[PDB]
Amino acid sequence: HVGTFENITAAPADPILGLADLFRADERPGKINLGIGVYFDETGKIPVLTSVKKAEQYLLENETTKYYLGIDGIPEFGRCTQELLFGKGSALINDKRARTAQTPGGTGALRVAADFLAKNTSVKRVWVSNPSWPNHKSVFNSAGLEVREYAYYDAENHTLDFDALINSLNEAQAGDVVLFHGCCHNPTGIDPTLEQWQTLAQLSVEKGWLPLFDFAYQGFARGLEEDAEGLRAFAAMHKELIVASSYSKNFGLYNERVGACTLVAADSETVDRAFSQMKAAIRANYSNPPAHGASVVATILSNDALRAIWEQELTDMRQRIQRMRQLFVNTLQEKGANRDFSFIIKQNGMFSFSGLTKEQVLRLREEFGVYAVASGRVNVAGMTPDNMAPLCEAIVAVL
Amino acid sequence: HVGTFENITAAPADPILGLADLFRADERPGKINLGIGVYFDETGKIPVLTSVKKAEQYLLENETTKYYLGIDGIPEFGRCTQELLFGKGSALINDKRARTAQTPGGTGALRVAADFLAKNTSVKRVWVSNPSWPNHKSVFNSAGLEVREYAYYDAENHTLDFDALINSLNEAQAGDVVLFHGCCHNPTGIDPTLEQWQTLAQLSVEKGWLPLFDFAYQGFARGLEEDAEGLRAFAAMHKELIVASSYSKNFGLYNERVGACTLVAADSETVDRAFSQMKAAIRANYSNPPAHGASVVATILSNDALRAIWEQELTDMRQRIQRMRQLFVNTLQEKGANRDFSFIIKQNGMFSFSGLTKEQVLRLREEFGVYAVASGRVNVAGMTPDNMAPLCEAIVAVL
Ligand SMILES: Cc1ncc(COP(=O)(O)O)c(C=O)c1O
Ligand SMILES: Cc1ncc(COP(=O)(O)O)c(C=O)c1O
C-alpha cells in the first residue's frame, strides 16, 4: 500500500509569484520590486482607492444579509460591465445578445470560459500571443485545450510585427479560439492601432475564428472608452465572442477577485441557452462568486458621485505611470546608458518591455536587489521619484 | 460559418438553486422557503452575525491595501483552520504534516482537491454516499473523475445502514477516494457514532482508501470539538487525507466564499511537494482567493473577545434548530399527522430527511407555496414559530 502522494513531482515556481516570494525574503536594504503588476503610488505603497473605501463604508452600514448570490452574481454588476465594454447604447445590449457572469478575478473569467468551451463546444485549440501573460497557457491547459502561439513582437524595432502576426495565424482554423489583449498588452505594452484592429476583425470574420478578449487594464492606455475601441470593432462584425475582464487593476481591488465573463451570441435565445451551460460550469467549480469586491464595483459604477471620484483616481494612476515612463528614459540617459530606451515612451500600461536578457535580469536581482521578471518585463508603476536613480544606476551597470 | 454556440443544449436546472429561483418569483405572500441550506433567525431573516459586523468594521478602518494574497491565502486563516479541524495540539500540526489553502467556499475546496487529484495522481474514482449533496457528482465529474455510490440510508427505519455501507465499500479498491461528510450528513442528518467512525478508519487503512472529508457544518451537530471526533479518529491512523471545509454556514458568510482545502501526507517533505501542485491547480483556476470573507474569519478566530461572541452565536443557531425540530414534530401531531415523525429528533444539522415523495413535494410547492427539495429534504433552520402552523397544515394535507 504505497502512498497516493509519493509519485508526485514538485511544481515549478511561478515566474511572477515565485519572484515576489524571493523579494519578500531578501534582507538587503534598498531592494526594489518591479515584478508583479500592481500600481504603486508616489511613496511606494499599494493604496485602497478613496472611492472604494467610501463604497465599503456604505456596504458595512447597509448590508443586512450574506445570503448567496446567484451563480452569475450581482445583476447590476453585469449590466455596468456591458456598458463599460460595449458602450452605453450598443446594439449588442439592446438586442440582448450578451450575458455576463461575475467571476473571481480575470483569471476566474478565463477559466470559466475554458471549462465552458471544453465541455460544450468542438473547440480544441486556443491561440495566444508570443509573448503573453504566462498564466494564459496554464488556464486553458487546465481544461484540456491545446494552446498554440502566434507571433506578435518585433524586438528589433520595439513594435508590433503585424506581418508576422498575420502570417503566423494562417493555420488558425474556423472554430479555433484566438486570444487578444484588449489594451495594454502584457508584457510588451504594444497594442494594435485602430486600423490594425479593424484589419484583424475583418480577417477573423473571414477565417471563422472565435475571438476571446482579455481585458485586464481598461483605462490604463488612453481612457475607458478609447481602450475598448478594438473590442468594439470586433463586436460590430462578429456573431460570437467572449470577453474576460478584470477589475483587479483599474479599481485596485486585487485580492477581492472581481472579474466578469461575457458571452456574445447571434441572438438572445442562443446566448441564453449557451449561458445556462456556462452557469453549470461555474456551479461545479466555486458554486457562486464572492460578493464584497463586486458589490464595491457595482456601487461605484451606478452612483454618479462615486463614479466621478473613481474615474479621476484612475486618471491619476494612468498619468503617474506615463510620468514615470518619461523619467525612466531621461534618468537612464543621465546615468550614462548608450542604448536608446525611447521606445519605452510609446508603450502602454503598467509595464515596459525593456529588452534586458535573462542574464542581466539575474545580475540585477543578485547584485543590486532590483527585481524584474526573467523576460525583462519591468513594472513602471513600481518606479518612484525616490527609487529611480538607484534603479537606473543598476541597469546601466549590467548593460 | 455556422456558429460555435448554435448547437449547445441548455443545461437542466440545479435541483437546489433552480428551486430557489422559483421561490423568488412566486407571488404568493404566504410562501415558505425550506430549500437551500441557510440559517434563518426566529423573525425569518438571514442575518449577518454580530461578530462578523464587528470584524468588518475593524477591517474597514485598518485595511491599507488590497494587494494580492498568496496562492494559498492568509497564513493565520490556515493555522486557525488546522486547529479547528485537528485540535489545539495535534501531532499532524506539530509534525508539519498538513498544508491548507484558503479557497472560494467549500465548493471551491472540493474542486481544487478534485483538480489536484485528477492532474497529479493515478486516482480515477471517487466514492460518494447515496444520497449526498447533489453537487458532489458535478464537481468530481468536471475534473474528470468517475463517481461511484455507496449505500448509507435505511429508508424504512430512518437510520444509518451500517452493514450495507461496509458491504458496498468493499468494492472500493486501494487508491480510490472515499468521501465522508464530517458531521450533519447532507441530506439525511444521520452521522456515524464515534465507534462507527473508528471502525471505518481501521477499515480505511487496511483497504488503502484515500479519505476525503467534506466539513460544511462543523458546530451544528453537537459542538466544534465534538463534531470533529470522526475526522480526528481518521487522522490518528492515516498517512494521507484531504479535508474540504466551509465557513459559509457556521459564520453565516455564504456569499463571501470562505472555505479551505487541507492536505495531509506522511511527512513534511511529501506534503510540501504535493502542496506545490495544489497551488499550481489554484493558479490556473482563480489565481488567488478572495480576501474579505477569510479576513473576517481570521480576525474572529484570532481575537479572544470576538471568538467568544462567535461561539455563542453558533451555539444559539444550533439550539434554535433543535427547538424547531421538536416543535416541528409536536405540531405535526397536533395538525393531524397519521405518521410517527419522531425520527426527526434524532437527525443532526440544518435539515430533516422527511420521507415525503417527489409527488408530495410537488404538491406542497404548487398548492401550498411550501418549497422543499424534490428528495424530501427540508431545512429545519427555515422553520419559525410563525410559519410552523401553516407549514404543518400543508404537510398533513398532502399525506
Ligand atoms: C492579461 C491579463 N489577464 C488576466 C490577469 C489576471 O487578472 P486577475 O488578478 O484579476 O485575476 C492579468 C494580471 O494579473 C493580466 O495581465
Ligand atoms: C456537504 C456540503 N458540502 C459543500 C457545500 C458547499 O459549501 P459552500 O457554499 O461554501 O460552497 C454544502 C452546502 O452548500 C454542503 O452541504
User: DSSP string of A157-198?
Assistant: TTEE-HHHHHHHTTTPPTT-EEEEESSS-TTT-----HHHHH
Whether the upstream peptide bond of residue B131 has omega within 30° of 0, thus cis, is: yes
A243: cell is 470577453
CB environment A228-257: b (16+ within 10 A), e (fewer): bbbbbbbbeebbbbbbbbbbbbbbbbbbbb
Q: Which residue in B15, B39, B34 sits closest to B349, CA to CA?
A: B39
Report d(CA B245, CA B381) in Å as an integer: 20
A69: cell is 448570490
The Cβ of residue B166 has, within 10 Å, a number of other Cβ atoms equal to 15
Q: Which residue in A35, A25, A129 sits closest to A391, CA to CA?
A: A35
Are A85 and A238 a contacting pair, CB within 8 Å?
Answer: no
As a whole number of Å, the end-to-end CA separation of chain B is: 56
Helix (H) or strand (E) holding A283: helix A268-283
CB A100 less than 6 A from any atom of ligand 1: no
Phi, psi of B100 (to 5 degrees): -125, 135
Residues 199-228, chain A, touching B (beta carbon < 8 A) = 208, 210
Q: Which residue in A240, A215, A244, A216 sits closest to A230, CA to CA?
A: A215
User: B170 CB contacts (<8 Å, ≥6 apart)?
Assistant: B207
Report d(CA B325, CA B128) in Å as an integer: 27
User: B36 CB contacts (<8 Å, ≥6 apart)?
Assistant: A68, B16, B17, B19, B20, B379
The Cβ of residue A266 has, within 10 Å, a number of other Cβ atoms equal to 15
* Residues flanking ligand 2, CB < 6 Å: A 287; B 37, 105-107, 133, 181, 186, 214, 216, 246, 248, 259
Q: Which residue in A204, A293, A199 sits closest to A246, CA to CA?
A: A293
User: Do residue B284 and residue A139 have CB atoms under 8 angstroms apart?
Assistant: yes
The experimental technique behind this entry is X-ray
**CA torsion angle B285 B286 B289 B293 (round to 10):** -110
Angle at A261 between CA A255 and CA A264, to 5 degrees: 165
The DSSP string of B171-226 is GPPTT-EEEEESSS-TTT-----HHHHHHHHHHHHHHT-EEEEEES-TTSSS-TTG
Report d(CA B149, CA B47) in Å as an integer: 36
User: Do residue B286 and residue A283 have CB atoms under 8 angstroms apart?
Assistant: no
A302: cell is 451606478
**Among chain A residues, CA nearest to B70:** A17
Report d(CA A29, CA A390) in Å as an integer: 12
Number of residues that make up chain A? 399
Helix (H) or strand (E) holding A213: strand A210-215
- Distance, CA of B38 to chain centre: 11
Breaks following residues of chain A (C-to-N distance > 2.5 Å): none
Number of residues that make up chain B? 399
Residue B6 three-state SS: coil
Write the CA distances from A190 to A157, A160, A347, B221, B260, integer angstroms: 12, 6, 6, 58, 40
Phi, psi of B258 (to 5 degrees): -120, 110
- Which position has the grid cell 492536505? B263
Are B317 and A50 a contacting pair, CB within 8 Å?
Answer: no
- Positive/negative CA dihedral, A188, A190, A191, A192: negative
Report d(CA A91, CA A239) in Å as an integer: 12
Q: Which residue in A176, A154, A173 sits closest to A165, CA to CA?
A: A154
Report d(CA A324, CA B220) in Å as an integer: 55
User: Do residue A45 and residue B60 have CB atoms under 8 angstroms apart?
Assistant: no
Is B249 considered catalytic here? yes
Whether the upstream peptide bond of residue B390 has omega within 30° of 0, thus cis, is: no
Q: Which residue in A147, A311, A112, A133 sits closest to A218, CA to CA?
A: A311
Q: Which residue in B260, B58, B56, B69 sits closest to A256, CA to CA?
A: B69
Q: Check CB contact of B29 with chain A, cutoff 8 Å.
A: no
**CA torsion angle B114 B117 B122 B123 (round to 10):** -40
Query: Which residues are registered as beta bridge partners of A259?
Result: A103, A246
Are B95 and B152 a contacting pair, CB within 8 Å?
Answer: no
User: B99 CB contacts (<8 Å, ≥6 apart)?
Assistant: B72, B78, B262, B263, B271, B272, B274, B275, B278
The Cβ of residue B332 has, within 10 Å, a number of other Cβ atoms equal to 24
Query: Which residues are registered as beta bridge partners of A148?
Result: A127
User: B331 CB contacts (<8 Å, ≥6 apart)?
Assistant: B388, B389, B392
- CATH match for A52-305 among 3.30.479.30, 3.60.21.10, 1.10.260.40, 3.40.640.10: 3.40.640.10
User: Whose alpha carbon is nearest atom 14 of ligand 2?
Assistant: B37
CATH, range B53-305 = 3.40.640.10
Report d(CA A198, CA A180) in Å as an integer: 13
A25 CB burial (10 A radius; 0-12, 13-18, 19+): exposed
Angle of helix B304-334 relative to helix B388-398, nearest 10 degrees?
40
Q: Which residue in A309, A127, A124, A279 sits closest to A203, CA to CA?
A: A127
User: A306 CB contacts (<8 Å, ≥6 apart)?
Assistant: A51, A54, A55, A299, A300
Report d(CA A31, CA B129) in Å as an integer: 54
Are B372 and B382 a contacting pair, CB within 8 Å?
Answer: no
Are A86 and A116 a contacting pair, CB within 8 Å?
Answer: no
A129 CA from centroid of ligand 2 (Å): 39
The DSSP string of B113-155 is HHHHHHHHS---EEEEEES--THHHHHHHHTT-EEEEEE-EET
Q: Check CB contact of B330 with chain A, cutoff 8 Å.
A: no
Mutate to test the pocket of ligand 2, among B19, B107, B183, B184 (most ligand atoms within 8 A of CB): B107
User: A330 CB contacts (<8 Å, ≥6 apart)?
Assistant: none
Q: Which residue in A366, A357, A348, A354 sits closest to A392, CA to CA?
A: A354
Chain A residues near residue B38 by CB distance under 8 angstroms: 67-68
Write the CA distances from A32 to B55, B68, B121, integer angstroms: 34, 18, 40
- Distance, CA of B390 to chain centre: 29
Report d(CA A33, CA A378) in Å as an integer: 9
Q: Which residue in B166, B162, B120, B167 sits closest to B145, CA to CA?
A: B120
A337: cell is 546608458
Report d(CA B123, CA B171) in Å as an integer: 15
**Among chain B residues, CA nearest to A109:** B286
Q: Which residue in B165, B170, B167, B168 sits closest to B181, CA to CA?
A: B165
Q: Check CB contact of A147 with chain B, cutoff 8 Å.
A: no
Phi, psi of A361 (to 5 degrees): -65, -40
Q: Which residue in B103, B350, B117 sits closest to B219, CA to CA?
A: B350
B83 CB burial (10 A radius; 0-12, 13-18, 19+): middle
The residue type of A206 is: E
B106 CA from centroid of ligand 2 (Å): 5
Angle of helix A291-301 relative to helix B291-301, nearest 10 degrees?
130
Q: How many CB pairs lie under 8 A apart between chains A and B?
A: 247
Q: Check CB contact of A237 with chain B, cutoff 8 Å.
A: no
Write the CA distances from A49 to A42, A45, A258, A307, integer angstroms: 14, 12, 15, 12
User: A336 CB contacts (<8 Å, ≥6 apart)?
Assistant: A396
How many angstroms is the resolution? 1.9
B213 CA from centroid of ligand 2 (Å): 12
Which residues of chain B form beta strands (DSSP E)?
32-33, 98-103, 125-130, 146-151, 153-154, 159-160, 177-181, 210-215, 241-246, 259-264, 351-353, 370-371, 377-379
- Positive/negative CA dihedral, A348, A351, A352, A355: negative
Report d(CA B259, CA B103) in Å as an integer: 5
Are A36 and B287 a contacting pair, CB within 8 Å?
Answer: no
Report the nearest atom of ligand 2 relative to the CA of B247: 10
Angle of helix B75-86 relative to helix B291-301, nearest 10 degrees?
60
- Distance, CA of A173 to chain centre: 25
A229 CA from centroid of ligand 2 (Å): 42
Report d(CA A48, CA B334) in Å as an integer: 58
Q: Which residue in B373, B350, B379 sits closest to B360, CA to CA?
A: B373
Q: Which residue in B381, B80, B84, B36 sits closest to B215, CA to CA?
A: B84
Write the CA distances from B314 to A66, B243, B309, B310, integer angstroms: 16, 21, 9, 6
Helix (H) or strand (E) holding A351: strand A351-353
Whether the upstream peptide bond of residue A187 has omega within 30° of 0, thus cis, is: yes
